[PDB]
Design a protein around this ligand. Structure first.
Ligand SMILES: [Mg+2]
Ligand SMILES: [Mg+2]
Ligand SMILES: [Mg+2]
Ligand SMILES: [Mg+2]
Ligand SMILES: [Mg+2]
Ligand SMILES: [Mg+2]
Ligand SMILES: [Mg+2]
Ligand SMILES: [Mg+2]
Ligand SMILES: [Mg+2]
Lengths: 121, 71, 25, 181, 84
RNA sequence: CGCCUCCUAAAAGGUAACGGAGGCGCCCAAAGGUCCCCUCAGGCGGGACGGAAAUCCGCCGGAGAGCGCAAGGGUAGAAGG
RNA sequence: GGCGACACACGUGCUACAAUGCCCACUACAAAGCGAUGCCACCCGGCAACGGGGAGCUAAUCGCAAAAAGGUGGGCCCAGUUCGGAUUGGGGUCUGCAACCCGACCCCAUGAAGCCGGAAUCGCUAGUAAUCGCGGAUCAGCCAUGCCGCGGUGAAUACG
């Protein structure tokens, strides 16, 4: 039974399975199942339908999930856009926002390596 | 139609927390799906679980209680 | 790992404490 | 013949409210739907003809009617083709079958759309035919997800006997289609 | 962060120049050297000539920038590309 | 250097020049015979991956499509599919 | 304000690519140092950084302090998978007129690239190599993965 939208985790151990959902981490999956009181050591394939709909009545109402959480964060970047803040133009240029010296290695946000002329050869 | 590889399309049943659509007339009877929209849940009925907005209640009104910088 | 801010091994390499490494053994 | 709730919902609540709205004198110029069509544009199936063997029956599970393939009309070399090359398949649904497909469409198929916040309301052709297409096919309850290997959506057509789209917008709202107001 | 033990808007030099522009009219652009200051909530719809190091740049205070400080809206570094 | 098509060719036909401009020396057991059914190219909106058109709706569209290949004649009340 | 700018290139380092491994609970054992214009035992509130009270200590008598690897038990079944932690959103705690360019942390989500490194190249001959943590200097605090030291477990090989 699908729990969070359509793309959900299944097949072997609910406790670390739920972590695969964006917006659901290791701490809140431990903070949301004991309040439903479901055994973390069970395999997701063998569960009663009562708790899979009880778990589908407790995590998608308390907080935002994958689709709607991305919509706010993407708009949060757009909200920090068109104002002229240092956080806004740093995203439009596609460079890291918290310090992180860009002279040396910053390839995570910039992307792949490019090669220029490079004098004295 | 015509006899061959054609589904007979028997009356079926579908179970969810929203309810049992008694009729539903589809192939592979007594099927399990996650939800049923337009019954009671699924926003057409105005649920709004999180009422996400942070431009007024903690950014414009009731502002002196804490800091700023977004929602 | 040692750089993971959410584990026992990462807090000792950093030197900070919290939920994943409380000030109580 | 076969008792359908959506046509019962039509003939009891949707049918008389529209006569009150536009003042239809006779019982026939009221908007009426007959012949909904489903088109599955498998452009990626140009290379393979065995993939259509694993897609015609999967569209048949949600309609209860075998679909027919459509061949290429002409030739354009920017796409891999010939005069043959079965690419897409299209099936039409009518009385007592088009009604039951919509009942599973509005309530079970449609909620599976991630971040569904209404349908695009200005997608009318001007005559009264509201077209829309979907990109995922496992939204239907007949798909168990353990038998799918290829992701492919579809373009369900639409129909009415309405002259204008202003008449069809009401019938498309009274029957239960969620729009963006 | 101050972490709420102490309140926001640390500089007392520009608030003396803006806390009467609300009661008294005459909306005037004002120059400043207080980059470190926080933005002001009760003075939306105005402008401030924030100093970046050489030239006081004017910035229209809008309804969204009630959160960030003044230095983020005043770049002290310009790039314009490097493909030249 | 032989054959086909248009023009010159002067309204039957025919008509020359080292006059203008193209094709042919093939192809098809289906692209043939018969019976039955179906109607094009385009234009406009609408529609997941879809862009100037991949497949699909709904109007408009009697010929500009198509008829294996050059061109002409002809053709949907089909020789077209 | 800049010394931290970034389409690039190089040197030194750090954490990794996992199962002779990762996580969680309990349980042990060091040396060298520092600290009354400080270290903070011990409670209370907070998931936590920390805050409020508050005992002792001019200190082989008090505190930093917990050492970690190790040991016991449980989970994971080898899948870019509780390996791996970057990058980004939100919320916060301390220092300090004062943290946007330029801090350090804490929490909730991100959890990307990387599945053993082309040509080349470095270190080491006995408690060294490898691996594991602790302290000090400067310092209000700090980008310290650096540098100066201290201990824990402990190989291989050398015909020549
Ligand atoms: Mg996840
Ligand atoms: Mg060279
Ligand atoms: Mg003649
Ligand atoms: Mg003549
Ligand atoms: Mg004549
Ligand atoms: Mg279009
Ligand atoms: Mg420097
Ligand atoms: Mg003693
Ligand atoms: Mg030697």
């Amino acid at each position: 039974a699908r729990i969070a939208g359509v793309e959900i985790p299944r097949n072997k151990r609910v406790d670390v399975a739920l972590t695969y959902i964006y917006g659901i981490g290791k701490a809140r999956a431990k903070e949301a199942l004991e309040k439903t009181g479901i055994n973390p050591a069970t395999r997701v394939k063998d569960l009663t339908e009562a708790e899979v709909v009880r778990l589908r009545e407790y995590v998608e109402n308390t907080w935002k999930l994958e689709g709607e959480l991305r919509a706010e964060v993407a708009a949060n970047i757009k909200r920090l856009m068109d104002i002229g803040c240092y956080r806004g133009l740093r995203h439009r240029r596609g460079l890291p926002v918290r310090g992180q010296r860009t002279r040396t290695n910053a390839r995570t946000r910039k992307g792949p390596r490019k090669t220029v002329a490079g004098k004295k050869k | 139609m015509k006899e061959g590889i054609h589904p007979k399309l028997v009356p079926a049943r579908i179970i969810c927390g929203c309810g049992n659509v008694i009729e539903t007339y589809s192939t592979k009877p007594e099927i399990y799906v996650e939800v049923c929209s337009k019954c009671h849940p699924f926003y057409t009925g105005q649920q709004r679980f999180v009422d996400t907005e942070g431009r007024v209640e903690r950014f414009q009104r009731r502002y002196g209680d804490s800091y700023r910088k977004g929602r | 790992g040692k750089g993971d801010r959410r584990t026992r091994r990462g807090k000792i390499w950093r030197g900070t404490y919290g939920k994943y490494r409380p000030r109580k053994k | 013949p076969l008792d359908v709730a959506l046509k019962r919902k039509y003939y009891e609540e949707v049918r008389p409210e529209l006569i009150r709205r536009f003042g239809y004198q006779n019982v026939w110029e009221v908007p009426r739907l007959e012949k909904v069509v489903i088109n599955q544009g498998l452009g990626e199936a140009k290379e393979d003809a065995r993939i259509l063997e694993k897609a015609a029956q999967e569209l048949a599970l949600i309609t209860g009617q075998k679909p027919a393939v459509t061949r290429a009309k002409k030739s354009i070399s920017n796409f891999k083709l010939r005069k043959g090359m079965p690419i897409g398949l299209r099936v039409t649904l009518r009385r007592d079958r088009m009604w039951i497909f919509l009942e599973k469409l509005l309530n079970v198929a449609l909620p599976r759309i991630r971040d569904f916040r209404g349908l695009n309301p200005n997608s009318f052709d001007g005559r009264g035919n509201y077209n829309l297409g979907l990109r995922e096919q496992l939204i239907f309850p007949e798909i168990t997800y353990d038998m799918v290997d290829a992701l492919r959506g579809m373009d369900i057509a639409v129909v009415t006997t309405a002259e204008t789209d202003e008449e069809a917008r009401a019938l498309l709202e009274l029957l239960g289609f969620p729009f963006r107001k | 962060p101050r972490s709420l033990k102490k309140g926001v808007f640390v500089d007392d030099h520009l608030l003396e120049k803006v806390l009467e522009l609300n009661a008294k009219g005459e909306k005037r652009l004002i120059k400043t050297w207080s980059r470190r200051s926080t933005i002001v909530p009760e003075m939306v719809g105005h402008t401030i000539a924030v100093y970046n190091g050489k030239q006081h740049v004017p910035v229209y205070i809008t309804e969204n920038m009630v959160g960030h400080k003044l230095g983020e809206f005043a770049p002290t570094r310009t790039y314009r590309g490097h493909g030249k």
